[PDB]
Design a protein around this nucleic acid. Structure first.
Lengths: 57, 56
DNA sequence: CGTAGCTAATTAGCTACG
DNA sequence: CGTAGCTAATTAGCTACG
């Protein structure tokens, strides 16, 4: 079970979505941010967003 | 559009035209003029100092 | 201090083409 | 039709000098 993330949707509302896919966006040598792929349940569209630094990848 | 004599990160010397130029200066100081270059050898970008007379 | 935008990975959502 | 190729969008640290 992948943990849900609290995100402000592109629509505007807040929601506890669970990422379709998770990966680390980082230039070599150092860690960067964690990016999750989300699907807006409302409009059906996709959007990316930063994840908490301690989110399990 | 004027070429600038820069030392590439690759190590070689080249006469390159900067894609983007601007002034990197704090308040009250002159600072420097910075150019955005692209190493033709590797395709890698790098910043470098431009002459103080360069058109910004 | 000060500006500017590349860099990394990922894929949906296009367009393009054979 | 099927497939291949390009971009938008997502972060923050990095680097250039004086």
């Amino acid at each position: 079970g992948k943990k849900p993330v609290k995100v402000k949707t592109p629509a505007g509302k807040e929601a506890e979505l669970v990422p379709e896919k998770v990966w680390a966006l980082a230039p070599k040598g150092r860690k960067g941010v964690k990016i999750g792929l989300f699907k807006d349940p409302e409009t059906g569209k996709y959007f990316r967003h930063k994840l908490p630094d301690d989110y399990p990848i």
